[PDB]
Amino acid sequence: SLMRISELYPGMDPREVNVVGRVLKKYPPREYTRKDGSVGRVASLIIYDDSGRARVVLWDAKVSEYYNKIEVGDVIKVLDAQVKESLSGLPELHINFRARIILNPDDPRVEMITRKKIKDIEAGDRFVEVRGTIAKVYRVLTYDACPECKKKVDYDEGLGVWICPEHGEVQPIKMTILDFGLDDGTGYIRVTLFGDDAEELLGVSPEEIAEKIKELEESGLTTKEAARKLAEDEFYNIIGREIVVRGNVIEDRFLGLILRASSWEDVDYRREIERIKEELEKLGVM
Amino acid sequence: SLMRISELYPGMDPREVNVVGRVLKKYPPREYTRKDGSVGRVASLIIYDDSGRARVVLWDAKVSEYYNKIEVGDVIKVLDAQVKESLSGLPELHINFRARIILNPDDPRTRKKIKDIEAGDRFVEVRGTIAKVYRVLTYDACPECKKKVDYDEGLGVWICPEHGEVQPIKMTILDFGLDDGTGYIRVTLFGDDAEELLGVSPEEIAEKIKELEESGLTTKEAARKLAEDEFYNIIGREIVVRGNVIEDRFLGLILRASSWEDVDYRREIERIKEELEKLGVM
Amino acid sequence: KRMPATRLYIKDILEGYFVKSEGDFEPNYLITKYARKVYRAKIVGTVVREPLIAEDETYGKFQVDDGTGVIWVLGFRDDTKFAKLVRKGDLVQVIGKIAEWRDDKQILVEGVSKVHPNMWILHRYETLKEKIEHIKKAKIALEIYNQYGITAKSKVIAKNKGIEEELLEVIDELYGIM
Amino acid sequence: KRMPATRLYIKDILEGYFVKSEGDFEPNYLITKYARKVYRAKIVGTVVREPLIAEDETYGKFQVDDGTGVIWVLGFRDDTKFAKLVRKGDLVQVIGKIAEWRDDKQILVEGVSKVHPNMWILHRYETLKEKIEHIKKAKIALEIYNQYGITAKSKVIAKNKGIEEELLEVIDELYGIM
Amino acid sequence: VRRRKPAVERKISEIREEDTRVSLIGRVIKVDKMDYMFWLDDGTGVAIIESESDLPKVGQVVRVIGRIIRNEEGIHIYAEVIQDFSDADLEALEEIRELERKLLPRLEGEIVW
Amino acid sequence: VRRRKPAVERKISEIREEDTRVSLIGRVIKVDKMDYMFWLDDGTGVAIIESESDLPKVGQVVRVIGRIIRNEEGIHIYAEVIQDFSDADLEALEEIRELERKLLPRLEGEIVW
DNA sequence: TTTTTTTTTTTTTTTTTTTTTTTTTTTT
Ligand SMILES: [Zn+2]
Ligand SMILES: [Zn+2]
């Protein structure tokens, strides 16, 4: 079969299931309770081919039959397995009575192991890719955040500790906030980057930003005033840079559409030129 | 003839008797009284060859004919003599009318099932499973008679009642039971045969017996303990034992095994095929 | 006295009728479907699983398969040593007392030792020979029992035909069980 | 609202018609020869001279050449910082408001940053694509204007042909200028 | 209660569909030390024996007790027990297998209570 | 009022007599570190580039903007700007130069007021 | 041919901070 892990989908015919993968992870076998009250065994592995990864779940006698025979780095071939949706929406291979596994198979596969213009953007838009120029820098600042939920933590002066409303006493991490604007030639949209993505774009450490914010606040400025000042005085160099942002669009009750960018990346010029060539062909140029 | 003195037996055919021997001893001629009341003569000599010694008894005219002609160191050839059992159970050569002597001759010189076994049985072959291990121990023995030797604290030497001051050898004793499917019998192996079955040296067994005795156990208690604790692995093994059956006044039939050997499976299968043919299978 | 260990197929032990002696000193025995009174068993098979030794060393056990059946072999206290001797895959000969636990017959190990593959062949030959010998004798004894029962006349007739008196009692006991 | 920065050739800015809004809050804009209303400009060129920073730091300026024209880029007061960023020879992308000083169009710097040579190529491709798109739309809008002018009927016809209502007003304003 | 099914003695050519655990006796002709598999020839056929840990030697006579695995690639035996049958009299074994085949059903059928 | 003439994009082989400031793109083949001159090859020819301060490396792809100097020794370019064009897709640049050559004159000529 | 002597038997098991969007004019 030429089938790849990327082609698996939940509820696909087990008779079509024929994939190979190298074992990346093996988890310990576990007990589980059956509907009849008895106790069975279940064990999970993670495998991958040239296309992607899949969880492989060995059930009951399949654990005794194969689990100790498999090791990390080995390749297995999986046949006739049921495909289920994992808790993260991804395909998993269930090795029940019907399924088979071939250890280190003889198989040829073994050796191989949305763009939207700003003018079209709407409120609540999800997974939008926008390529444009950084046009304005609103605010640059850092706040103490919980390392788990990334929410703002409060300093308790009575106990001398940092308190997260969700996780209690935590060790705070410095979270960077970058608010700017982006222009694509057909529209303008506000953009917000957080932590590691913002630090990567700014090219300055969050600890260094915190020190500069402190100097500004000591001079008689509030947190709001100091954040706007640092963006204009030190991070104005970022304006004019062409970037690709991906995120979801939320509508602020006065600020308008704000693009909460999950990631940013440098422009792939050949990809962009190909998009333009498509548009030129539509106009009757080529 | 190639016959040796060691091959003589009482009542053997005098026509087969043909031995040579050097004269070791000559006793004086004596008179003896005949059944008819007359008086005869009899004289005895001791001769030996490369195999053993024999008393030679010259009767009546054979004394006059040969006695003075023979001397110590001379070799004689004895023919056609009657062989009798001496008072010590050994063969003697009787030189009567029929016999001849040549002075300084020119001469170059059964499978039985345990259910069928009885007390006093001799040369019995029994194939069965080792079922129990009674005792494993070693004792100091005489290298000649293999009997238990006594240590004398006054002289610091080992004394054998039969051979005197001797160098003791360690003798292994293995007492176990054997089962053949039709019966059960006690078995005893000695020395080299027992060591071969146990797969442990007698010196090593003596050391283990010493450790057990030091702990507060007697020789009897230590022998039973070592058999159960270390030699229990021998149980379940199929073997062939050969020996004589003696009846103990309370322990019952004990098979004193002269030898033991591994089972010849093809020989045993052939015996079973014979039994199957008798049942109308083949 | 010490009665014999009977060479049998595991199937014959498993299908038998265990008899618990009410006396604290009387030996337990089994009566096979072919009216064979068995006090001790002698079997030859393969150890199919790695032995089971209880952590507290109170018991040790191992499984033996001979082709006709599968039986457990148990050693208690220091007798756990017997189970430690064997390993998964060993071809062994076992002698012991027949026991019944949870209505399943088993063997209380008296001895276990590794055997040559030709011993397994010898065992099969002996087992079949003894089985035929016993069945033919029990068939004649059953006819005597159905005609006369357990009487002084039937005991004389049984001796004349090479049948032991005990065999008629085993038939009567088996009829009482069934 | 915040209208878009239009990607154009420097020549198109230079040849345009600057429109000064009379209101103190209204944004100034430019109308190109192809009837394109431009509030902000987005250009990609090379800095041809070392920047000019006034000694008193009141203004900072730098020159950009794109092959089709040469334009000055100005930053005032603290915005002088933009001119300090660049150096002679840098290949940069500039966004800003179009201004006219001494009847010469220029760019009031909003942002300037160094770009990869492939960005200059991407800029040329986008500039040409947008130009063709605009010209074809303006040609149809000009025919509508010559036939009907700025009427309720012409606005409906313009929407049907994918033309914005604002485009007809730009044509009328351009005719008034010329 | 899934009691352990005794290994059914078979020849490679006589393996049945309903058989789940078998006992085969043959000679090793090929050993794959990477996929842990070996080729067993008994005279009646060749079976592919998948082993977990014990790999025999080429030319060794062995007895295998294993579970039968039926897949799209064929029928292979997942070996549970592999014993050295190098000194075993297979002629005698064959003779006793025939004796059991003939006499065992007759002995059971003689019971007329 | 001598306003700065924009750099005219040319190939070395297409340089015209009337050209005073040009933009050339090529690979450096030789650098004279004493006379501050370097040899630029674009595929269509080789031009001698006289530099004031910036000297590129041999084998480096560079874009040069310079004034043309016409003397008895030949035509050399007095380099004003030298940019690193090492990662530049010259295939794409060549394609856009041809698109501009074809379409720009047609777009200007479409104006019928 | 040997040491030393009391035979055998039952029963026991496990996703974030904090919130008011954009805009003109100034140039040696
Ligand atoms: Zn938290
Ligand atoms: Zn002695």
Numbering used by the authors:
A (entry chain A): 62 to 174, 186 to 358
B (entry chain D): 62 to 170, 186 to 358
C (entry chain H), D (entry chain B): 3 to 180
E (entry chain I), F (entry chain C): 5 to 117
What did the publication describing this PDB structure actually write?
Replication Protein A (RPA) is a heterotrimeric single stranded DNA-binding protein with essential roles in DNA replication, recombination and repair. In Archaea, the same function is also fulfilled by a heterotrimeric RPA. We report three crystal structures and five cryo-EM structures of Pyrococcus abyssi RPA (hereafter referred to PabRPA), in its apo form as well as bound to ssDNA.
We also collected two independent cryo-EM SPA (single-particle analysis) datasets showing multiple PabRPAs coating the ssDNA by using a poly-dT100 oligonucleotide. Interestingly, 2D class averages reveal that PabRPA dimers adopt two different conformations in the two datasets. While their OB-1 domains are similarly oriented in both types of oligomeric forms, the OB-1 domain is more loosely packed to the adjacent Tri-C in the relaxed form than in the condensed one. Differences between the two DNA-bound PabRPA oligomeric forms are due to a rotation around the OB-1/OB-2 domains of the Rpa1 subunit. Importantly, in both types of filaments, the DNA-binding groove of OB-1 is ideally located to route the ssDNA from an RPA to the other, and protect the DNA from nucleases. In P. abyssi, we observed two forms of ssDNA-RPA assemblies: a relaxed mode with PabRPA molecules arranged in tandem, and a condensed mode with RPA molecules forming a helical-like structure.
